[PDB]
RNA sequence: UUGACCUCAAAUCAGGUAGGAGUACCCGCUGAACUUAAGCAUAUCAAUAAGCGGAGGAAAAGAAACCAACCGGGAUUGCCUUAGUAACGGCGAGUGAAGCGGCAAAAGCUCAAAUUUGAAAUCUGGUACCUUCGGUGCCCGAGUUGUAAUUUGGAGAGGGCA
RNA sequence: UCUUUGUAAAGUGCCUUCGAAGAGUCGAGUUGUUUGGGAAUGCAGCUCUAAGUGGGUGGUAAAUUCCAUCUAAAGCUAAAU
């Protein structure tokens, strides 16, 4: 709030913390990102490299739905099952009742493989999977099949 | 014959010819109107006649 | 129905018969006034589909509007400003000649609402429109509530506001991604997307 | 006018935004007015539920097709399957959509079941006589909440086949990428013997 | 066609059992009624041919279909506009040549 | 000669109607420049201010010649998001939406294209009466170059059959 | 209350014949403006100017071949604002 701002400590000091020689002016360097190629080149080319240019292709009418693909790692995979029944599922690890996890209904598009899923069989439902994720799922004894 | 604008009946002779109904371009829409108890008629037809 | 034949036959605007009719009609439209009442529509089929019913209360004016662009009214053709606006010739009016015709007819007969208007003919330096007018203060049209919506005070001078078929076209009020800027009024959308919507609890 | 390690802040205020700022002090006021409007509409049209019955439909796009939501209205095919007429449904308080089409059985089954359990849960006063004293409920949507479909069992047996799911995905993707060239080459062989 | 039941591919999409709903009377706005064909046949007989249309008849019947097809695309809007017009004029030439 | 009709007139004709004010908001048209770009011309300010025209309590838009590419949604409007993103731009300065999603509110329809053809079944106006934001009777007109009923694509019409 | 109000209308299931649906308009070219809309977003001027299983849209211009979704060139309508 105002009573703590240092302008209150600046009452009585003539230049108000802006220098006598500099004489704080209204717009000394231009306005906005002005002069990014002429006199602010060093600042732009030292702290924001790659600012100027046309890299890549122009995507017309980009809908973020097409690229909607939230990531899910195998370690985070077990968090989808509710807590009350997670404990009974890690124990009694059995092929004939393997928990099925609707990662898509949970809001995850792809299954990634950060790793170390325990040796229990889990049926994984997802839009996409990766080489290592499916290998580890098989290594745990479970299976992954795709949905849409 | 004096239908204004003329395109209202411009196709009637063609339409009559294709269907084969006899047609007569009579002089005066007022005559047609006065045989139908109106101001003008611009067209008149008989579909049935006493014996 | 004759109007089905009339509509298709009036579509052939370059046939010999249609050319002869428009040759004769453009002349006697020209020797009459710029704005003059037509005693009956010269395109009854077009008037019928645009809502003209041959009952007393409906009015048909014929209006003659100058062709060509709009020359910007600056003296000596000198527009003082940046060169991107120095252009005084070649500037195109944003309202169709149909819309200009409806406006001049409406301001001539201010006691009528402009139902619609339609191209009737055209020559080198004029365009010709028959403007469908409906009298809101005639008891015939006040009754028959199929048409009593136009005597509602919100519909007076709908051509000046741009509410007829041409007005909708000029403003680009159409459904589609082609009209994302102009869907409910480009000034409303512009104001909609330039407002700073601040809340009680800032977001 | 630019210095230090600060991100480039794209602020769109070169325009005279000050005349066009709209601050919503009336957020509390409009909420009270809206609740009053709901109160007066309910008092006006009592005892009908103050709102229509919306069908449960699947959301579009690949992102949201995992959630059902209240659509606009029941398609005419759903209304007749419930044994009604579109006009009659509108009067008794069923939202009807004429431009939506039913192409999914599961969605269609839910909606006709939604209508059937709506009819059995409403009562309609006769036009003539003493209408029975009914208590006004204020939310048809709440009385018939939108339900997520039950996908499958919580835990079932492993139906393994060694399909190598990822290899299927590459195979399907490669076929889609190369469908044209494999067809065109087959076409050239077929036309040139 | 039925979907493949996976998130990518030619027929990506969930397995559903469909309807094939009752066709809308729409999608038939372009369908030519019996009376409508009669009306347009009458108009062509009585109105005749438009100026460029006669030139196209001359061009298609003397120079060649391809060289008339290009000028129709210029004269009319686009290629498919020219395609429909040219195929029409071959029919009118055949109809007017016969009998 | 006399009646029409068509068009065009006049009337201190009978009955009406428009103008102007206000303009905070709204609908269009026209439309700058200062400014920014550390210069300046494209750009920006801005599809803004000023000018003009036109309404209401709201107006506009509005029931897809839509969005999508999905297990599809379903008039319009507004808010949160999308998103300071796709994209535009001396690709410089800067500019920059929309679909989906949640919510508020939700309401759908009407003409023209059909012959009633076994009967213009329609409507204004004058006049008389009355229970008068009007009704009835009679009359003059308008109207067949088309007024009512019927259909508006979701359909619907006609013809039987119960 | 009804001599006002049933030579009444409305809804519904078959089968059949159909099923008309908007032109200087869409669209194309060029010009100017405008847009985030980029081989051209929209509008406007001029020239050209259609079809009816057609037409429009499907955010890269064009041709070939399909699919998907709507039905323009006529109109009205409360609320949320």
Swiss-Prot record, chain A:
UniProt keyword Magnesium present: no
Effect of residue 37 to E: Confers resistance to cycloheximide, an inhibitor of polypeptide elongation
Cross-link type Glycyl lysine isopeptide (Lys-Gly) (interchain with G-Cter in ubiquitin), residue numbers: 95
InterPro entries tied to this protein: Ribosomal_uL15 (IPR030878), Ribosomal_uL15/eL18 (IPR021131), Ribosomal_uL15/eL18_sf (IPR036227), Ribosomal_uL15_CS (IPR001196)
Basic residues bias (residue ranges): 1-13, 20-29
Keyword Ligase listed: no
Main location class: cytoplasm
Extent of motif Nuclear localization signal: 6-12, 23-29
Keyword terms: Cytoplasm, Isopeptide bond, Ribonucleoprotein, Ribosomal protein, Ubl conjugation
Stored SUPFAM superfamilies: Ribosomal proteins L15p and L18e
UniProt-recorded Gene Ontology molecular function terms: RNA binding; structural constituent of ribosome
Described function: Component of the ribosome, a large ribonucleoprotein complex responsible for the synthesis of proteins in the cell. The small ribosomal subunit (SSU) binds messenger RNAs (mRNAs) and translates the encoded message by selecting cognate aminoacyl-transfer RNA (tRNA) molecules. The large subunit (LSU) contains the ribosomal catalytic site termed the peptidyl transferase center (PTC), which catalyzes the formation of peptide bonds, thereby polymerizing the amino acids delivered by tRNAs into a polypeptide chain.
HAMAP family referenced in this protein's UniProt entry, alphabetically: Ribosomal_uL15
Name of the molecule in the record: Large ribosomal subunit protein uL15
Originating species: Saccharomyces cerevisiae (strain ATCC 204508 / S288c)
From Swiss-Prot, chain C:
GO biological process: cytoplasmic translation
Region annotated Disordered, chain positions: 163-184
UniProt keyword list: Cytoplasm, Ribonucleoprotein, Ribosomal protein
Locations listed in the record: Cytoplasm
Keyword Cytoplasm set for record: yes
GO terms assigned for molecular function: RNA binding; structural constituent of ribosome
Gene3D superfamilies assigned to the protein according to its UniProt record, in alphabetical order: Ribosomal protein l15e
UniProt key word Cytoplasm: yes
InterPro entries registered for this protein in UniProt: Rbsml_eL15_core_dom_sf, Ribosomal_eL15, Ribosomal_eL15_CS, Ribosomal_uL23/eL15/eS24_sf
Chain ranges passing through the membrane: none
Record field: compositional bias (Basic residues): 168-184
GO cellular component: cytosol; cytosolic large ribosomal subunit
Pfam families with a match to the protein in the record: Ribosomal_L15e
Function comment: Component of the ribosome, a large ribonucleoprotein complex responsible for the synthesis of proteins in the cell. The small ribosomal subunit (SSU) binds messenger RNAs (mRNAs) and translates the encoded message by selecting cognate aminoacyl-transfer RNA (tRNA) molecules. The large subunit (LSU) contains the ribosomal catalytic site termed the peptidyl transferase center (PTC), which catalyzes the formation of peptide bonds, thereby polymerizing the amino acids delivered by tRNAs into a polypeptide chain.
PANTHER family: LARGE RIBOSOMAL SUBUNIT PROTEIN EL15 (PTHR11847:SF4), RIBOSOMAL PROTEIN L15 (PTHR11847)
Other facts noted in the record for this chain: There are 2 genes for eL15 in yeast.
Family according to the record: Belongs to the eukaryotic ribosomal protein eL15 family.
NCBIfam families (alphabetical): PRK04243.1 (NF003269)
Official protein name in the record: Large ribosomal subunit protein eL15A
Species name: Saccharomyces cerevisiae (strain ATCC 204508 / S288c)
Swiss-Prot record, chain D:
Gene Ontology MF terms: RNA binding; structural constituent of ribosome
Keyword Cytoplasm: yes
Modified residues (Phosphothreonine): 143, 151
GO biological process: cytoplasmic translation
Position of the signal peptide: none
Gene3D superfamilies membership: 1.20.5.110
Subcellular location: Cytoplasm
Family of this protein: Belongs to the eukaryotic ribosomal protein eL13 family.
Function: Component of the ribosome, a large ribonucleoprotein complex responsible for the synthesis of proteins in the cell. The small ribosomal subunit (SSU) binds messenger RNAs (mRNAs) and translates the encoded message by selecting cognate aminoacyl-transfer RNA (tRNA) molecules. The large subunit (LSU) contains the ribosomal catalytic site termed the peptidyl transferase center (PTC), which catalyzes the formation of peptide bonds, thereby polymerizing the amino acids delivered by tRNAs into a polypeptide chain.
Miscellaneous note of the record: Present with 133000 molecules/cell in log phase SD medium.
Subunit architecture: Component of the large ribosomal subunit (LSU). Mature yeast ribosomes consist of a small (40S) and a large (60S) subunit. The 40S small subunit contains 1 molecule of ribosomal RNA (18S rRNA) and 33 different proteins (encoded by 57 genes). The large 60S subunit contains 3 rRNA molecules (25S, 5.8S and 5S rRNA) and 46 different proteins (encoded by 81 genes).
Protein name: Large ribosomal subunit protein eL13A
Organism of derivation: Saccharomyces cerevisiae (strain ATCC 204508 / S288c) (Baker's yeast)
Gene this chain is encoded by: RPL13A
From Swiss-Prot, chain E:
Gene3D superfamilies: 60S ribosomal protein L36
Database matches in InterPro entries: Ribosomal_eL36 (IPR000509), Ribosomal_eL36_sf (IPR038097)
Keyword Ribosomal protein in record: yes
Subcellular location, record wording: Cytoplasm
Residue numbers bearing the N-acetylthreonine modification: 1
Keyword Transcription listed: no
Post-translational modifications reported in the UniProt record: N-terminally acetylated by acetyltransferase NatA.
Origin superkingdom: Eukaryota
Family matches, as Pfam families: Ribosomal_L36e
One cellular component (GO) term of this entry: cytosol
BP terms from Gene Ontology: cytoplasmic translation
Keywords of this entry: Acetylation, Cytoplasm, Ribonucleoprotein, Ribosomal protein
Alphabetized GO MF terms: RNA binding; structural constituent of ribosome
Family assignment from sequence similarity: Belongs to the eukaryotic ribosomal protein eL36 family.
Additional observations: Present with 31600 molecules/cell in log phase SD medium.
Function description: Component of the ribosome, a large ribonucleoprotein complex responsible for the synthesis of proteins in the cell. The small ribosomal subunit (SSU) binds messenger RNAs (mRNAs) and translates the encoded message by selecting cognate aminoacyl-transfer RNA (tRNA) molecules. The large subunit (LSU) contains the ribosomal catalytic site termed the peptidyl transferase center (PTC), which catalyzes the formation of peptide bonds, thereby polymerizing the amino acids delivered by tRNAs into a polypeptide chain.
Official protein name in the record: Large ribosomal subunit protein eL36A
